[PDB]
Design a protein around this ligand. Structure first.
Ligand code: FE
Ligand code: FE
Lengths: 311, 302
């Protein structure tokens, strides 16, 4: 489906040789991006604004400067912002082009991704280039450069294997799987790719990356979540224990309780703990698999409905 | 804290007799509410608008402060969610309050203003959150009805069962119109404690303005999974991308069963080792990313 974009890499090969850990770069004529449905509605800045009934993110030294200390803004007032140096991000663009939504969903299935995985489109736009510093995300991306050139640094992440959080060149959960020392800010010793119109970059989860640019760019970014097994399993375990009213009862700050009544609670918890262990022990792979439509990314979830409501 | 507000009712009483399951109604002079830090800049609809620098919810769509007053006349109700942003004075007070309520530290908590007129509000539903409500202007009609279908619900539900809820549902639901239910006419200086689970609806004949303090209701199930998660997340077998089996070849799915049987066992084992201190220590987790996200989304709109 995508296979017109990445041709001559097959898809079989994309899934065996590349996804979900090694980036793939695919050069070609920008024209061939038309095989995506809705692509026309996103080929230029003006096309996007024509369609984007939602608040637009604006990012720039021109905001620090017009706030003496990043924000949202009406689409009407957005070209004004762009013409003053300042990057625009149009999140959840798929909301306004149903055809690309239909596609992304087909893509989702092709990537054998869990059905409840988050998926959105975003367009980035900046008149005097820009970029961002070294960091890794927990999402995976297709990036389609439509206009301009952006220069990308890419670097295998040797510190963490399958990260579940964004990080910038450590949070309480990363320290638990971080190993070794980080790479230098300039990502020296990193693969350097310059994305030009018609270039598609598949950006796997966790790959260190930074960008520099000094030309007007326009890019369609497609973002998927990477739900881990942990996620489905806890969901499944949650399905199991949720009917037991004991597990529903309002939890309580330990610190609050007195000495005496605390002890009494350790008895109750220990016993809940037994039931959670018995229930875990009887988890089947089906039960895990059937939890594949749960929300694994409430943070994208809330953002999606909120933008629906602002529409 | 609010001994003041609900006097003659004691805090000892309120926690023993009412929270977290029995509604309470407490009447008196609205000057009592004068003590809620920032009550002044919320005492009227005009005030609320002067400070409320965000999109107002109309009932459901979101809307400018400007477009909102038009939907008021048209009888839609106005939710000024996350008002605490605009009077952060209140946030101290509330933070003391969840302390005294003995709620887990990472329990969600916001202020909301509601205002309605002619004559609208909210059809019958119950919430997984709990609220103090404070009547400031006007008279709001409330129907109330003991939930006899579910004990400690984990989601909202309106008269219409989802998957999770259907697991714990019992019996016949109430009538749509909520007969067999206590009506209650909340007037200025009235406070109502609305416990989680209780069926309720609102209607405002004339103009009403009410301040509302929502707290989340984190279950043990929540703290336990949080805690189970801290244990397991360091093991990389658990961070691997999941798949949708429906996709895979019969061979490839088998290979996945085995892979999973081996996680399941490690999971059973780490769950066998969970202490209660591990659970009490996850009390600061975030049990409601939904709210926390709205809070920041709204911040960016200010
Ligand atoms: Fe990124
Ligand atoms: Fe409600």
């Amino acid at each position: 489906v995508l296979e017109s974009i990445i041709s001559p890499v097959t898809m079989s090969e994309f899934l065996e040789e590349y996804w979900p850990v090694k980036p793939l770069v695919a050069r070609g004529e920008v024209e061939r991006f038309t095989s995506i449905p809705g692509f026309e509605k996103v080929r230029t800045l003006e096309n996007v604004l024509a369609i984007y009934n939602n608040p637009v993110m604006v990012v720039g030294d021109a905001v620090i400067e017009e706030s003496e200390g990043r924000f949202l803004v009406s689409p009407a007032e957005a070209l004004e912002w762009y013409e003053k140096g300042a990057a625009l991000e149009f999140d959840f663009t798929d909301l306004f082009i149903p055809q690309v939504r239909r596609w992304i969903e087909k893509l989702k299935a092709e990537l054998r991704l869990p059905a409840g995985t988050s998926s959105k489109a975003i367009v980035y736009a900046a008149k005097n280039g820009g970029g961002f510093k070294a960091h890794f995300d927990a999402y995976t991306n297709l990036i389609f450069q439509i206009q301009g050139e952006k220069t990308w640094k890419l670097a295998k992440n040797e510190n963490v294997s399958n990260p579940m959080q964004h990080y910038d060149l450590y949070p309480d959960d990363l320290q638990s799987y971080w190993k070794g020392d980080p790479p230098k800010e300039d990502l020296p010793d990193a693969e350097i790719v310059n994305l030009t119109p018609g270039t598609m970059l598949y950006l796997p989860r966790g790959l260190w990356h930074s960008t520099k640019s000094d030309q007007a760019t326009l890019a369609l970014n497609i973002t998927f979540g990477q739900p881990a097994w942990l996620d489905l399993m806890l969901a499944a375990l949650r399905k199991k224990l949720i009917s037991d009213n004991r597990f529903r009862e309002l939890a309580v700050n330990h610190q609050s309780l007195h000495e005496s009544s605390k002890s009494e609670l350790n008895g109750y918890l220990e016993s809940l703990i037994q039931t959670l262990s018995e229930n875990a022990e009887t988890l089947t792979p089906e039960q895990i698999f059937q939890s594949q439509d749960s929300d694994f990314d409430p943070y994208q979830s809330t953002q999606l409905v909120f933008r629906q409501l602002l529409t």
